[PDB]
């Protein structure tokens with residue numbers, strides 16, 4: 408189609424004429440986001456322009472990664488791709504990438520911030536995060552940085568997860584990541600959901616750590632210092648010296664810490680915020696918890712198609728990553 412050009416916040420935007428009335432809404436991962444009206448579909452959309460998508464090998468691979476991830480995700484509670492385009496007419500001229508999705512009006516950081524949610528709202532918002540995570544996790548994808556600011560929400564409380572798989576943000580991070588364990592599992596995301604849910608219910612950051620050390624201190628204050636079963640799983644001499652040097656802490660009584668909350672919410676919280684990540688509830692199990700009795704339907708909580716992440720192990724030239732991304736743009740098929 409016919410492109411047209413404009414400057415918005417120092418940044419140039421060259422987009423097809425179908426997208427009208429571009430309006431800056433803020434920063435995205437590795438780029439800027441504009442709200443727009445899609446004259447073809449009649450949809451309000453969000454367009455992200457990647458900044459310097461092919462600046463280095465790291466950027467090139469990251470651009471490919473995000474495009475591959477967005478092309479794969481087709482789920483109500485996960486951001487997906489409505490369109491992807493470039494003003495470039497050929498591979499040699501290919502230097503910019505624009506990604507388009509449904510416009511979402513706010514995020515949970517905007518919502519919780521100075522606005523108290525009812526237990527009914529929390530059930531629905533957390534149900535939707537878990538339903539999305541079930542899907543993401545079934546594709547062997549980990550979010551790794553789940554936090555209120557990457558949960559997009561509309562005025563009717565429909566929620567989508569963004570910025571998954573790209574990999575303070577500290578506040579929502581699993582303690583095994585604070586300890587720098589490289590073999591963490593998908594349940595790091597469940598830890599983050601627990602932190603988020605706690606905050607939705609209480610109106611305060613559960614673990615507002617001032618650094619990595621402070622963050623673990625705050626976590627261990629609630630959940631206790633590791634037991635013997637967990638300590639035996641820590642290979643790192645240094646990590647063990649640190650953890651075993653702290654004054655032992657008992658696990659607190661969650662019913663007391665979150666007193667006044669729905670006892671079912673308290674129960675789910677204790678299953679999510681388990682120190683040993685092997686013992687944490689999974690997204691699929693969490694959906695079946697009684698807290699979500701009014702929302703849960705196992706016939707309407709789909710899993711994802713298999714997703715090939717083998718490229719992640721590959722070390723390629725910028726031009727190779729760029730060409731792979733270009734072919735992914737050209738092969739894009741929009742949804743129905």
Ligand SMILES: O=C(CO)N1CCC(c2n[nH]c(-c3ccc(Cl)cc3)c2-c2ccncn2)CC1
Nearest residue numbers: 432433434435440453455506507508509510511
């Ligand atoms: O922090 C803020 C605002 O202060 N924001 C929260 C994050 C928010 C945001 N970040 N990234 C996207 C995005 C856009 C298109 C694609 Cl294909 C993929 C990701 C959005 C967004 C914005 C609106 N609707 C949908 N996505 C931008 C605004």
Ligand SMILES: Fc1ccc(-c2c[nH]nc2-c2ccnc(F)c2)cc1
Nearest residue numbers: 582583586588640641650682683684
């Ligand atoms: F203070 C602590 C101690 C251990 C964890 C922890 C939770 N789940 N898994 C681990 C873990 C397993 C193996 N090696 C590690 F380094 C960490 C988290 C905080």
